[PDB]
Symmetry: C5
Subunit: 307 residues, 5 copies
């Protein structure tokens, strides 16, 4: 079984697509293995770039296809190169930009943790033909973090394995296991942008909603919460157009719902305060002073939803 | 008449385009048939990957083209492999990402059931030349529905059938029946996002809109439903920028129509109250107390849409 | 002059681009013509799919280029096939997805009728070298209009003709008339979404706008109309995001202008009623009670605009 | 010095990209010149389409690359044809779709004049090797401007010229002047949509804004002007959502500023009228009667911008 | 150790993607080196364009791969040309369009400085095989700045340097230093559009927001701030849709934040004015008349944040 040692050089992980559960990786693949010795010009190793690799492949050089298992679509490949050594060994070297796929839970956006994954597995040779001897991953990364959207935690965690397929070809003995390289990079979303620009004003809006109770008349109280209502809606629209599209609510969505809830609840209180009476216009001296009651009741429920 | 057995491996179904009635599928086709026996190197099956498959084809390897009927555009193809066994049999193996077309009725959005379909048919060989002998489809599926946009339901439907074409070339005898593979994968929409961030708050606005009748004055009543009206427009737009583009109204779209509708009737009821009089400002104590009438009048007419 | 019979199978018409005056057609071209007898294996017709076709051309098979005249950019091609008959004939068979160009008037959107057109014409052989003997077009059609954006109406129209070019090569006598196929498909827009979701509420807004004259006070009357004005802009904004970019107004675009007018009209009337006085509030004791005047005076300007 | 005559057929100029200063051109290029005499089948001119052209090149057919200087990216090419006449002459014919670049000032949008440009210059041969002998451009354009985004005006400006490059090899004699073909086609924007749906309603907003002064009270005067303000903003968003992206202001932009300009001046005045006093409520009965004063001042400042 | 001279001709820098930290460059690479003498037709240099360059490479011509280290995806290449001189020297010539990557801090948008960078480094040859001898960059730009999005300011920076890779393949002796060309171009953003259309009206919004204190009553003061609140929100959304998506805040973002705060600050000030009393309605003469106070209190907090 030919031992292929692999190297991934990750140049950029960027472009996350939340709806698609997809992220873009720019980098190099390096694959190395040893064949039967060759005679090269001089006796210094031989270089074969791009186009000529196919010419070499035609006259019979084994360059096994290594497919990116979790790539969506087939990757943009840049220069390719062969280094042929006389002692037999072969080095395949190529640049790639691919859009990769992984399960991505975004429900605690903008406080989500994600993991970028690469899965590599030979397209046609099983573990008895081609086996992954090792893999190094160079994440040429560090520092300058707050300008950066995602905070990389690790330094590329790795797992080589054997994948067994129960449903394949006309194959019986044990030729149904392929070797797989799985590369993981752990990350955390930098939530500041959402804290200052989405969370904060959404809060100031919700906060001032409560100031409806500092209004003198009932006509004033009831008529204003309609504006307040229009404002939360105005805010949702501002929000939605900019934030990632998901098939679920985020923490920010729920704050909006809660704002809708708060204002619609005050509507009930404002209306109820008025018509529950011992005459007709008995505004409950005590209930009308829930100006401090349910800002902190919202503050209590604010903590209860987080548990 | 050659028996061709096929396997589809579905990796990801994603990117539904509502306006286009379209969705993306990543996966593998495996097609197999038996030829006249070959003398292969050693005696184990010969592997041929990508660039070299053409070379075998140029020298007369029969590799029949199996086209994806309902593909829009020509699919992105990944690695291809030919495996030539010595006893005659040949297996074609390839990866694809393609956009497939199928009738997609989105009218009960966000509660639609959709069906992702793949249709397979030889491009040049009819059922007397090439026949589909059987087909399994593996949906490497499980888990995390709650994380996903669509929830797949069945295990996948399969049907081999024979399609007869009545109008073609100058060929008649019986070369007009092609053998067809049809794959069906059932799905349901994840409704929850739309329930909580569209339906519910649109629902609160509708109700709180009705609180306009709890206003004491006539002037307050009428002037206020104009803000209520402006709110629904603002809401409608929020919805519009976010929801899928269609050529018909969805259940949400209708909720907005009703919202506009409730508000406009309220204008009428409120004006009717005022100027229908025995003085000038005799607001029908009873009709202004339709504070209970058309809130539950809306629920009756809302439940009439269920037939 | 080689007689070529053509067949187009129209699979999908989708992707209208109103700014570009463009649409997408998925389908197959079939071209048939007769050369000199060939020897085919057995004596049964010979099949040549995709890759092998070019190779036949290298050995001199005449496969003439038939160009899509009105295609924007060059079409995505699927599988190509040649059926070479021993009796002399050749049949060319191809799938295409193309972005096609045609004049499209959108002024009565969402009630426009459009016609999707294909224009076929040889790239290198004139009508005395190659002539279109005929052309039939199959629109595999039926059902589900209510599901679709466009309603195909006809069954497809035809035109075989001669296009005369006055300025060409160093050759003058008659290498200037090429034969052209024109395929025409009629369509109507499914107007229902824009009917219920844009027209109706836009109407209810305009309608309820007129209820300004039912307000007792002048402040009520003049200030309320400012809200109305804001509502129409909000409505304008709501719309624009969804409507197609055109360089002219549509029907909806006019209802909007009509609205701004009706509102701007009342601002003036409300100011006029009040400040044309012999005191300060000498409202033309009746004019303010034009609650029927320019609502139905507006309706009059509406039917005349349909001239 | 090979005389090459060039002919361009322009089919569609479309898809202007304002941020990029880019527009699309679909059409055919035709280049003609005479080489040394050839023996053709019979003695009738020989046609060489697509694939077969390369074959002719590999055997030494001189086919010079003529590059589109101002093309962004490389053009989409459709069919190509070589016509080889026996007397020596060669005719190259190919269809193209390209994104072309030219300086585009959009500041008087929507009343801008633009010029679509093509620049053709050999990639490898200087004016002493390959010279452009003449060039005609056919603009198969006409009719129906009212339907189209752009109004093509002229019949196309043409200039064959000599371009001198100062920095190349160790060459002294004269190898540094390349011959260039330049096509100019003038156009004007169809302003109608923006006139009717951007300028007119905008003016009415501005106009109806000045009616803030016909309000009786001060509250009304100040409080309403905030409503007016929100309106200008709402209008601004609707506009931006739709208007082309630029790095400078357009006429419309300036209008929006003016709307903001009108309102903020009005607020100042309304407060000034109120508190500039000899009492407390000496509202300047006259300055609050600047109801026609700064409508003609906005009109004066509007017409002065042309000076 | 082969000396390579390089030239970059920058035709266009355009299409910055703020989220991707990406920009587009159109231009030509010219690489020159000296090989072993050739016999060319006559003795004048031989020109070899496009398709034919591979053919020369197939026969063993060394045309080394020079990679753009920082390009995202593989560049679109136009014409390629090989110039083979008889004295030995070889000149490679090509047009390119690529999307390049580089670090871009966008935080003081729209007054940011950015730098468009090109990085070139041989794909397979280290500094002992292939060395960069010198490099020029020509930016055929000038004039018309006030029309363009970025104002290129300096000329262009160049640095030939040696990159040492400590961890590669299994090669150690000295094969780990590659020579790298680095091109730097400084640019500043055209701030004008944002100053006039975004900053300016926002100032007018914020300022006129403070005139809420010139209102006589408490109701006028409190309720009107809710209108002010809705206005700033509307301004935010209008802005959002238009400004470049970043994962962190800009100057304008903060202005919006500030604007929100200003409004929320005043709600508190206004309510406090009402309820901090020695009667019930002691509206604090200074705090009610803080009409000069936090208009200039906002200017104090505004300038220190600039420091
Ligand atoms: C057995 C195989 C066949 C092809 C599809 C699968 C999914 C399964 C991956 C693989 N590497 C290639 C191995
Ligand atoms: C007869 C055929 C020829 C080509 C077009 C059609 C539609 C009809 C499908 C097919 N599989 C391929 C079979
Ligand atoms: C002669 C031709 C040459 C090329 C351009 C024209 C417009 C005229 C169309 C055509 N099919 C191709 C035939
Ligand atoms: C001389 C040349 C060489 C190459 C680069 C330049 C810029 C200058 C354009 C050209 N067409 C191709 C001609
Ligand atoms: C307040 C709003 C209400 C709705 C219409 C306006 C025009 C004004 C734009 C907006 N995005 C949504 C915000
Ligand atoms: C040594 C190398 C090998 C390949 C990948 C790296 C990242 C490292 C860049 C390089 N130019 C090409 C040089």
């Amino acid at each position: 079984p030919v031992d292929v040692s692999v190297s991934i050089f990750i140049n950029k992980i960027y472009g996350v697509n939340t709806l698609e559960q997809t992220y873009k990786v720019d980098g190099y693949i390096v694959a190395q293995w040893t064949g039967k010795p060759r005679k090269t010009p001089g006796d210094k190793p031989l270089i074969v770039e791009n186009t000529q690799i196919e010419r070499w492949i035609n006259n019979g050089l084994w360059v096994p296809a290594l497919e990116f298992i979790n790539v969506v679509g087939s990757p943009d490949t840049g220069n390719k190169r062969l280094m042929l050594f006389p002692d037999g060994r072969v080095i395949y070297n190529a640049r790639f930009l691919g859009s990769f796929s992984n399960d991505m839970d975004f429900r605690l956006f903008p406080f989500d943790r994600q993991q970028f994954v690469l899965e590599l597995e030979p397209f046609s040779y099983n573990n008895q033909q081609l086996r992954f001897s090792d893999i190094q991953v160079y994440t040429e990364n560090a520092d300058n973090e707050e300008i950066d959207e995602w905070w990389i935690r690790g330094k590329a965690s790795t797992h080589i394995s054997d994948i067994r397929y129960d449903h394949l070809s006309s194959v019986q003995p044990n030729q149904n296991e392929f070797s797989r390289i799985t590369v993981r990079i752990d990350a955390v979303r930098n939530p500041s942008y959402y804290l200052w620009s989405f969370i904060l004003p959404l809060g100031l809006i919700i906060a001032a909603s409560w100031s409806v109770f500092w209004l003198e008349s009932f006509s004033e109280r009831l008529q204003t919460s309609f504006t307040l209502m229009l404002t939360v809606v105005a805010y949702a629209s501002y929000t939605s157009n900019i934030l990632p599209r998901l098939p679920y609510t985020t923490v920010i969505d729920q704050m909006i719902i809660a704002g809708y809830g708060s204002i619609f609840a005050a509507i009930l209180l404002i209306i109820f305060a008025h018509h529950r009476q011992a005459n007709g216009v008995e505004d409950d001296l005590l209930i009308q002073r829930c100006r401090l009651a349910f800002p902190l009741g919202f503050l209590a429920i604010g903590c209860v939803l987080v548990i």
